[PDB]
Paper text:
Here we evaluated the pharmacological profile of [name]-531 that was computationally designed to selectively target two key resistance drivers, epidermal growth factor receptor and phosphatidylinositol 3-OH kinase ([name]). [name]-531 exhibits low-nanomolar potency against both targets with a high degree of specificity predicted by cocrystal structural analyses. Here, we show that [name]-531 acts as a weak agonist of peroxisome proliferator-activated receptor-γ, an attribute that likely mitigates hyperglycemia induced by [name] inhibition.
We hypothesized that the absence of hyperglycemia in mice treated with [name]-531 stems from the molecule’s unique ability to act as an agonist of the nuclear hormone receptor PPARγ. We next sought to generate an X-ray crystal structure of [name]-531 bound to PPARγ to provide structural evidence for their interaction. Clear electron density at the compound-binding site revealed binding of the entire compound, allowing an unambiguous placement of the ligand. The functional groups at the 6-position quinazoline core in [name]-531 bind at a site distinct from the orthosteric pocket that binds rosiglitazone.
Author numbering: 204 to 262, 275 to 476
The structure:
């Protein structure tokens, strides 16, 4: 109903379109799988060691093998997030060093945001929705691996209570990427100008898509604080594993992201 609000609607639709093309497992598909809907197939459930071995047939010790699988999927997600970032208007026109800095510090916050879409209080979807690993099984793994996912479930349960959908999440993750407060940025003003447009589009999106949810925009921005805490704790646990497991190797792409965080 306004020239400016029409541009914000166009930006919201552009990003939702790019989000669908970049991320193969959407929140809508994940919910259809988690709530037994007829549009998708039921997953094989891994709740103990026997189901894990039968799951490896259907779909290093156990804990390290699961940890390696998570880091493989995180590498895949970095690739998907990088592809999505390039579709955000203005992102590819930024200084190349700043594009790398924004992704270095942004990918982990986005991974945990999108991981919540695959989670409920009972567990997490794996193998592109083919499987489901229980929260209790992950918590039963030998230390320090049994503590890696628990804080992610705590965040996911709170974040999922906002009931965001894919069109909401597309603009939210773009806002996370264009954060002008990352360490080492050379040209902050161009980044903040883009983030302002994205925040304007996110605000209008949440008002139209959730007309009964008061201050959902503020509640969602307050979750960006929960995401930082999760990222910091995750890095601390990786340092513990680095010294305890001299045999374990971390992917080069993930190695560069963690350096000097």
């Amino acid at each position: 109903l306004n020239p400016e609000s029409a541009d914000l609607r166009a930006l919201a639709k552009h990003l939702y379109d790019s989000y669908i093309k970049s991320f193969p497992l959407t929140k809508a598909k994940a919910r259809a799988i988690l709530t037994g809907k007829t549009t998708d197939k039921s997953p094989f459930v891994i709740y103990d060691m026997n189901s894990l071995m039968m799951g490896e047939d259907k779909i290093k010790e156990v804990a390290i093998r699961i940890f390696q699988g998570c880091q493989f999927r995180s590498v895949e997600a970095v690739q998907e997030i990088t592809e999505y970032a390039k579709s955000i208007p203005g992102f590819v026109n930024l200084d190349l060093n700043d594009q790398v800095t924004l992704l270095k510090y942004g990918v982990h916050e986005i991974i945990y945001t999108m991981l919540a879409s695959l989670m409920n209080k009972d567990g997490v979807l794996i193998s592109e929705g083919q499987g489901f690993m229980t929260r209790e099984f992950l918590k039963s793994l030998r230390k320090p691996f049994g503590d890696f996912m628990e804080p992610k479930f705590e965040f996911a349960v709170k974040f999922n209570a906002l009931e965001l959908d894919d069109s909401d999440l597309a603009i939210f993750i773009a806002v996370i990427i264009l954060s002008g407060d990352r360490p080492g940025l050379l040209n902050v003003k161009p980044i903040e100008d883009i983030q302002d447009n994205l925040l304007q589009a996110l605000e209008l999106q949440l008002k139209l898509n959730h007309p009964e949810s008061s201050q959902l925009f503020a509640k969602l921005l307050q979750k960006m604080t929960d995401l930082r805490q999760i990222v910091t704790e995750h890095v601390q646990l990786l340092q513990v594993i680095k010294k305890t497991e001299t045999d374990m190797s971390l992917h080069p792409l993930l190695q560069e992201i963690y350096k000097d965080l």
